[PDB]
Amino acid sequence: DPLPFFPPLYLGGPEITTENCEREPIHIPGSIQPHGALLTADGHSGEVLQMSLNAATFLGQEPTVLRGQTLAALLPEQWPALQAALPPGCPDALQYRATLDWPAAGHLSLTVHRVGELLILEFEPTEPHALRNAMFALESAPNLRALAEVATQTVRELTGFDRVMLYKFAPDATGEVIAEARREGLHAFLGHRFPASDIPAQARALYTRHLLRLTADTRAAAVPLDPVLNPQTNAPTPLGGAVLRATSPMHMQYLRNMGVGSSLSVSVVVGGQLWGLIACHHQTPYVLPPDLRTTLEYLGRLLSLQVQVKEALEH
Amino acid sequence: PFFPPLYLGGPEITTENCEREPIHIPGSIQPHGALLTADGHSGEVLQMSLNAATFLGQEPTVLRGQTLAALLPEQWPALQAALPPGCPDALQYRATLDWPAAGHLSLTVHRVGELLILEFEPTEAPHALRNAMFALESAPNLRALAEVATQTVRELTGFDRVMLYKFAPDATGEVIAEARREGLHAFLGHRFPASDIPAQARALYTRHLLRLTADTRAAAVPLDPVLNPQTNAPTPLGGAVLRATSPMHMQYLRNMGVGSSLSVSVVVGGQLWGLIACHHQTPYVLPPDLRTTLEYLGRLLSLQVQVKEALEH
Numbered sequence: 001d002p003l004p005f006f007p008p009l010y011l012g013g014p015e016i017t018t019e020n021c022e023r024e025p026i027h028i029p030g031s032i033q034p035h036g037a038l039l040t041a042d043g044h045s046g047e048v049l050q051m052s053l054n055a056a057t058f059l060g061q062e063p064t065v066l067r068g069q070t071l072a073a074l075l076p077e078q079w080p081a082l083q084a085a086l087p088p089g090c091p092d093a094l095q096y097r098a099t100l101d102w103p104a105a106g107h108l109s110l111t112v113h114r115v116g117e118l119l120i121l122e123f124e125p126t127e128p129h130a131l132r133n134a135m136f137a138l139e140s141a142p143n144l145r146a147l148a149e150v151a152t153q154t155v156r157e158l159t160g161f162d163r164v165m166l167y168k169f170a171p172d173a174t175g176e177v178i179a180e181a182r183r184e185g186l187h188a189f190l191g192h193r194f195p196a197s198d199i200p201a202q203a204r205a206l207y208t209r210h211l212l213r214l215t216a217d218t219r220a221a222a223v224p225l226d227p228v229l230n231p232q233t234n235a236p237t238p239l240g241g242a243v244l245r246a247t248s249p250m251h252m253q254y255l256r257n258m259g260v261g262s263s264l265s266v267s268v269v270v271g272g273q274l275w276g277l278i279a280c281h282h283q284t285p286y287v288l289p290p291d292l293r294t295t296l297e298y299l300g301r302l303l304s305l306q307v308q309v310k311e312a313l314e315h
Numbered sequence: 316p317f318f319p320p321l322y323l324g325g326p327e328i329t330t331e332n333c334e335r336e337p338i339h340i341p342g343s344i345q346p347h348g349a350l351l352t353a354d355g356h357s358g359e360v361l362q363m364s365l366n367a368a369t370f371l372g373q374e375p376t377v378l379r380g381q382t383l384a385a386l387l388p389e390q391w392p393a394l395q396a397a398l399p400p401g402c403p404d405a406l407q408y409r410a411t412l413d414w415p416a417a418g419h420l421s422l423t424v425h426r427v428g429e430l431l432i433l434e435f436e437p438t439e440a441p442h443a444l445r446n447a448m449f450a451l452e453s454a455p456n457l458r459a460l461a462e463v464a465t466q467t468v469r470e471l472t473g474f475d476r477v478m479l480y481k482f483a484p485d486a487t488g489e490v491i492a493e494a495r496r497e498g499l500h501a502f503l504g505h506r507f508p509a510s511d512i513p514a515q516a517r518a519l520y521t522r523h524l525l526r527l528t529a530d531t532r533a534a535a536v537p538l539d540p541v542l543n544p545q546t547n548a549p550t551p552l553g554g555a556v557l558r559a560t561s562p563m564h565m566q567y568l569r570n571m572g573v574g575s576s577l578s579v580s581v582v583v584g585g586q587l588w589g590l591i592a593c594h595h596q597t598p599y600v601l602p603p604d605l606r607t608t609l610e611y612l613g614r615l616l617s618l619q620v621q622v623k624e625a626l627e628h
């Protein structure tokens with residue numbers, strides 16, 4: 001039965017059990033994963049409102065100094081570019097990316113998107129023809145099976161992940177591993193099926209709009225935003241569009257129990273519906289840098305197109 | 316059918332026989348790169364472009380005996396695996412060579428039956444592609460998508476004019492969006508007859524998705540031999556971007572005052588929906604890595620055109 005979200009934990013909401021999976025408000029956890037930092041800022045003035053508690057250690061500045069400046073002063077070269085790329089009223093799915101040379105922290109990748117009157121800024125550390133070669137190989141795959149196999153093998157070669165699977169949704173939202181590339185010694189998931197509640201309905205809706213999510217370390221504690229609520233609204237900060245957003249504790253426990261230290265998946269979206277997932281696993285924690293993740297994002301789109309094409313060749 | 320090419324004493328093309336120019340087998344290439352053909356098994360260099368000596372820095376005869384194994388040691392096994400016998404002519408493999416004579420070359424290979432076609436071009440060596448991808452996806456409708464696409468391509472390439480050229484059901488073309496330098500004629504809104512892009516050219520554009528003329532006044536460079544030794548027949552060059560552009564079309568571009576021309580096919584439901592079409596007033600060799608960006612954009616636009624057309628119908 002579909003039911004509306006509970007309030008999050010920090011607003012006195014209940015703790016999540018196998019009874020109430022579909023009601024955890026996974027988009028507003030009030031916290032991020034510790035391998036990057038996040039700031040929120042007023043979309044018109046550029047006043048800095050919220051920051052992750054670890055921000056001082058990524059950005060090399062005291063909180064009170066950060067919060068006491070506008071983005072115009074903090075990001076003089078990027079602030080006008082942000083404002084042109086992310087105009088008021090734009091969708092929350094639109095992202096702008098730049099690379100910064102920050103004194104204390106080396107090269108940072110900056111990813112920005114806009115939710116209403118809020119700008120959300122994510123900072124992460126950042127670092128030949130493999131993509132072009134893959135694009136052509138995907139297109140020349142003769143059928144859906146060969147496409148799925150080429151796609152899994154390519155992603156594994158690009159990333160070094162222990163396991164890469166193509167997980168396909170059935171009409172009842174149960175899913176099935178239909179191809180996989182895996183490290184020697186791992187047991188096969190190929191052909192196994194899993195119940196629809198393994199990925200609940202409010203996750204599947206979110207995964208149709210925001211096409212890549214990840215858990216870099218399934219044992220890492222989440223880092224709170226400070227303050228936790230958006231001071232504009234005294235309400236929760238929407239983090240559905242932020243890759244840094246904390247994974248749900250239910251899902252992290254599901255993964256630890258499987259022996260997984262790192263997770264990533266790309267949505268494959270066909271005709272406006274979530275067709276399936278490029279889901280990857282690593283046994284140890286593992287951070288895939290932003291520019292490599294971009295390659296996977298591009299492959300997500302290519303695969304969406306090629307899945308349509310291969311399936312049309314099939315009636 | 317097709318007329319024989321000129322160099323096999325076929326008729327010269329006119330506006331009476333537009334549909335029968337054998338544009339895939341011109342026997343020549345554009346001079347900003349070099350092309351070798353080679354045997355699929357032996358790696359034996361069978362044809363070369365008369366200009367190969369320039370790019371490769373090799374005494375002419377040296378090449379036309381040697382083997383790819385010898386000539387490209389690191390690459391030759393990769394090719395063997397990347398382009399297995401029986402693969403499609405559409406499948407391409409690329410690498411960057413740090414080659415003694417020329418700082419860096421791009422190498423592009425595909426296979427047509429028993430022949431490997433190798434293309435060499437100068438090359439080199441950020442977020443504009445990722446930023447463009449998200450911009451295309453958040454365009455609210457087909458019109459805005461067209462506008463974003465043309466603007467994005469112009470910004471990435473510096474081309475004087477970028478258009479989105481959409482085919483009607485009878486192959487009548489319409490310019491539905493345009494991004495252009497100040498002080499050019501506007502082709503926005505204009506329609507053009509199907510015969511400007513003739514049927515045999517449209518078919519080839521459905522399979523091989525990027526072509527160009529780098530300089531509309533440059534002479535083609537012959538293949539030597541012109542005929543493939545294997546077959547004593549013309550080498551199919553339609554999957555080669557270095558393939559000499561039909562003089563009928565280079566004349567159409569000179570009469571427009573265009574010095575440089577590139578286009579990317581937008582393919583939807585197995586059919587040619589449209590073209591990203593680019594003009595430059597002067598000669599312009601777009602480097603391979605930037606062309607790759609446009610090739611990606613072509614696929615992304617193909618996806619988004621279907622998405623956007625579905626939310627009208």
Ligand SMILES: *C/C=C1/C(=C/c2[nH]c(/C=C3[NH+]=C(/C=C4\NC(=O)C(C=C)=C4C)C(C)=C\3CCC(=O)O)c(CCC(=O)O)c2C)NC(=O)[C@H]1C
Nearest residue numbers: 017018021194197198199203247248250251263264265279
């Ligand atoms: C009471 C709730 C439960 C629950 C919740 C849940 N699941 C997700 C998202 C995912 N679940 C996945 C499950 C699988 N991983 C596999 O490898 C296989 C099969 C071999 C399955 C079935 C996957 C892949 C995802 C997607 C994300 C990822 O790549 O890890 C969420 C949302 C998490 C978030 O975005 O923060 C939630 C809340 N799963 C259950 O089994 C029950 C107990």
Ligand SMILES: *C/C=C1/C(=C/c2[nH]c(/C=C3[NH+]=C(/C=C4\NC(=O)C(C=C)=C4C)C(C)=C\3CCC(=O)O)c(CCC(=O)O)c2C)NC(=O)[C@H]1C
Nearest residue numbers: 329330333338502507511512516560561564567576577578
């Ligand atoms: C007797 C045949 C003629 C003919 C042949 C022909 N046309 C092409 C390819 C193209 N024609 C194009 C025409 C236009 N470009 C524009 O900007 C506009 C409108 C403003 C039109 C109508 C285009 C865009 C192409 C695609 C190639 C490109 O990107 O430049 C070919 C094929 C050439 C080749 O690939 O080798 C041929 C043989 N064109 C005519 O107009 C008649 C006289």
